């Protein structure tokens, strides 16, 4: 019998996906051929293990998949290693944090508040749990980062590791000093690219790769792949060591059909129009943060040189939770953001998170940013109406999914 | 662009899934709905959090594909609480120690050697790593748990929780001797039912709900549905507690089209169909068992309660891997395990887990096992040979996959 009831459910998400204007930064839509793969019977096989040194026979053909997945990976990003079985950027960075470090020992991450995530410190994650936290954040005026304030912390507290990444910081890394702040102090640089990963890819962001010990990434978000984790290094001794970490430390068996998912996504990041793609997301993100501006909205940083941007609220007396739900009224769905130096707690926070990647695969282009920014700011000003919720949705139905 | 030399390598695994006899314990084969579910368009959300309680806006549908997956793991397995949010079984039985330990803390599991899994214990896994372990295992007499024994390590080392369960047991487990036992130190008592999953839904297999303090579990093997994790408990307080754990505790965004999968999963278990394929499973091994006793094998125990067994090779002169490597050269494929206190070091070992579960989903039947049974011996005995291997190819193509 067919599940007709779950069937309808995702019939109604497709619906919801093509008429509303995803704008959360960590969204995007992934192609048809990334959800064959994906939906494969590669899931019918427990392939513990690593390729030529599996737990189980029959993995011939499966090992093949996996080592394509590595050998692009590897290809797109300029390694020497890469692990594509994490089943998520949180496994990936867990996986990497006890391989270096030794429950009790010094991490040093950004400030949740300043845009670090959730695997950077946070005292309710395993990161702040099991690892002694020390933070860095962002200057009161520019709101950027200040490189001799994180040199600072790092000579006073003496992290074992110490991460660069975020998931809602707008500018661009400095990962050869942030290298050089931990050599001073013998520390390991673990970068967490998950956000930018795909403008590496395209050459719109400075790699990391060279600098850091270590990188993670999720293989969804920028780079527009499966859900899903991934690790790099250029140095493949210290490759050996975390492989063990994924396999058999943290993980049971790999989700093969994922990894196969992984494969094309590297495939699509590798072709001419990936750059096309990633230049256009760029360019939507500064241009609609510009239009926001001119309607009188304060863009944290004042601008960005990457695919979101954080809007603080606090001059418009709305609190972020606020925002997103009047947004989310009309079909337009971003999702509440601490900004930096934020007065109202977490649940509230006063400001919203918004990001280009997922519009601009359905073709939107900057020049149709004003008339997103116009959507924006009437919601914001007049609230949820039936009009504008038709408005957002003709817009949208205008532009197809993949 | 089509990825066509990975969508080539898919078509090469999927004949050889085909072409072959699957007789690996933990392997099954999902229906064509579980996959296209997974394939969906559902992987394109961020749903961090909890039905009604999420970080992003977006969610209305999401949450009732949720919800569904959770209120039918409550009415398929007798449970007042679900988190179906775990990527594998190993990150649900994570997130439970976790809830239930600090690091330091003392873990009770069976033994890898006598049918453990790696994380109830293993050394090279987090089981291991954060927490001192006590392992338990097999008479050399009896072949089976002593429940005197058990009680004796769990007085003298008093650990904090003690995990019921194992990935090569081949009979019942008594969950309230377990229950008493760990009643009686004042520990937590964790059953792992992963590998048994499908049995209990089917009734066919006792079910520890009201036994043990949590349940974790996967939610493919047995339960023939998408690789992932479960947990359910009869106690919604200490629930709570556990979904904090999952997340933020240990996981991001979950996967939200594998929950779709998880749900119809749960579906074609509720059906009928569904304790008629579980008889079946466990008549085919428990028939086959004897097939191979009568061909000159002596099984573990002498038989099986469940969809697997041992076989004890000794009586033939074989180890497990020149088993291992003759069955997986005519297309069968099985794993090397060892017996009670086998005379082989681990990595050879004098035996075999054999399971019927994804030969069953093909259409296996009782009266087949006996044709089986003597492939099996031929290979054994005659090794390789092209005859015999498309023997077995024939059969398996007889028998059509879902």
Same mark, same amino acid.
């Given at each position: 019998?067919?599940?007709?009831?779950?069937?309808?459910?995702?019939?109604?998400?497709?619906?919801?996906?093509?008429?509303?204007?995803?704008?959360?930064?960590?969204?995007?839509?992934?192609?048809? @051929?990334?959800?064959?793969?994906?939906?494969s019977?590669?899931?019918?096989?427990?392939?513990?293990?690593?390729?030529?040194?599996?737990?189980? #026979?029959?993995?011939?053909?499966?090992?093949?998949?996996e080592?394509?997945?590595?050998?692009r990976?590897?290809?797109?990003? #300029?390694?020497?290693?890469?692990?594509?079985?994490?089943?998520?950027?949180? @496994?990936?960075?867990?996986?990497?944090?006890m391989?270096?470090?030794?429950?009790?020992?010094?991490?040093?991450?950004?400030?949740?508040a300043?845009?670090?995530?959730?695997?950077?410190?946070?005292?309710?994650?395993?990161?702040?749990?099991?690892?002694?936290?020390?933070?860095?954040?962002?200057?009161?005026?520019?709101?950027?980062?200040?490189?001799?304030?994180?040199?600072?912390?790092?000579?006073?507290?003496?992290?074992?590791?110490?991460?660069?990444?975020?998931?809602?910081?707008?500018?661009?890394?400095?990962?050869?000093?942030?290298?050089?702040?931990?050599?001073?102090?013998?520390?390991?640089?673990?970068?967490?690219?998950?956000?930018?990963? #795909?403008?590496?890819?395209?050459g719109?962001?400075?790699?990391?790769?060279?600098?850091?010990?270590?990188?993670?990434?999720?293989?969804?978000?920028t780079?527009?792949?499966?859900?899903?984790?991934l690790?790099?290094?250029?140095?493949?001794?210290?490759g050996?060591?975390?492989?063990?970490?994924?396999?058999?430390?943290? @993980?049971?068996?790999?989700?093969?059909?994922?990894?196969?998912?992984?494969?094309?996504?590297?495939?699509?990041?590798? @072709?001419?129009?990936?750059?096309?793609?990633?230049?256009?997301?760029?360019?939507?993100?500064?241009?609609?943060?510009?239009?926001?501006?001119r309607?009188?909205?304060?863009?944290?940083?004042?601008?960005?040189?990457?695919?979101?941007?954080?809007?603080?609220?606090?001059?418009?007396?709305?609190?972020?939770?606020?925002?997103?739900?009047?947004l989310?009224?009309?079909?337009?769905?971003?999702?509440?953001?601490?900004?930096?130096?934020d007065?109202?707690?977490?649940?509230?926070?006063?400001?919203?998170?918004?990001?280009?990647?997922?519009?601009?695969?359905?073709?939107?282009?900057?020049?149709?940013?004003?008339?997103?920014?116009?959507?924006?700011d009437?919601?914001?000003?007049?609230?949820?109406?039936?009009?504008?919720?038709?408005?957002?949705?003709?817009?949208?139905?205008?532009?197809?999914?993949?």
């Amino acid at each position: 019998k067919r599940d007709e009831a779950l069937f309808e459910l995702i019939a109604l998400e497709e619906k919801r996906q093509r008429e509303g204007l995803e704008l959360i930064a960590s969204e995007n839509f992934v192609s048809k @051929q990334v959800r064959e793969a994906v939906g494969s019977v590669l899931t019918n096989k427990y392939a513990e293990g690593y390729p030529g040194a599996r737990y189980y #026979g029959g993995c011939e053909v499966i090992d093949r998949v996996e080592s394509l997945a590595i050998e692009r990976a590897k290809a797109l990003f #300029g390694a020497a290693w890469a692990n594509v079985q994490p089943h998520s950027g949180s @496994q990936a960075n867990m996986a990497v944090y006890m391989a270096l470090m030794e429950p009790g020992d010094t991490l040093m991450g950004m400030d949740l508040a300043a845009g670090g995530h959730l695997t950077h410190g946070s005292r309710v994650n395993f990161s702040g749990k099991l690892y002694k936290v020390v933070s860095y954040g962002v200057r009161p005026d520019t709101e950027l980062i200040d490189l001799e304030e994180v040199r600072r912390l790092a000579l006073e507290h003496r992290p074992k590791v110490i991460v660069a990444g975020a998931s809602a910081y707008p500018r661009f890394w400095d990962f050869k000093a942030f290298r050089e702040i931990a050599d001073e102090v013998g520390a390991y640089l673990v970068v967490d690219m998950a956000h930018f990963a #795909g403008l590496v890819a395209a050459g719109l962001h400075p790699n990391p790769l060279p600098y850091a010990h270590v990188v993670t990434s999720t293989t969804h978000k920028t780079l527009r792949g499966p859900r899903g984790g991934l690790i790099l290094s250029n140095d493949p001794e210290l490759g050996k060591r975390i492989d063990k970490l994924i396999f058999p430390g943290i @993980q049971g068996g790999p989700l093969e059909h994922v990894i196969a998912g992984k494969a094309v996504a590297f495939f699509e990041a590798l @072709q001419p129009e990936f750059k096309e793609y990633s230049r256009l997301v760029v360019e939507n993100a500064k241009r609609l943060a510009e239009e926001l501006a001119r309607r009188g909205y304060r863009i944290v940083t004042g601008g960005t040189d990457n695919h979101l941007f954080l809007v603080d609220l606090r001059p418009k007396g709305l609190t972020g939770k606020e925002a997103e739900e009047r947004l989310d009224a009309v079909g337009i769905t971003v999702n509440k953001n601490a900004i930096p130096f934020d007065p109202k707690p977490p649940r509230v926070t006063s400001g919203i998170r918004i990001g280009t990647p997922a519009i601009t695969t359905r073709g939107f282009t900057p020049e149709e940013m004003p008339l997103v920014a116009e959507l924006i700011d009437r919601a914001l000003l007049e609230g949820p109406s039936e009009a504008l919720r038709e408005e957002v949705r003709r817009l949208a139905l205008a532009h197809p999914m993949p």
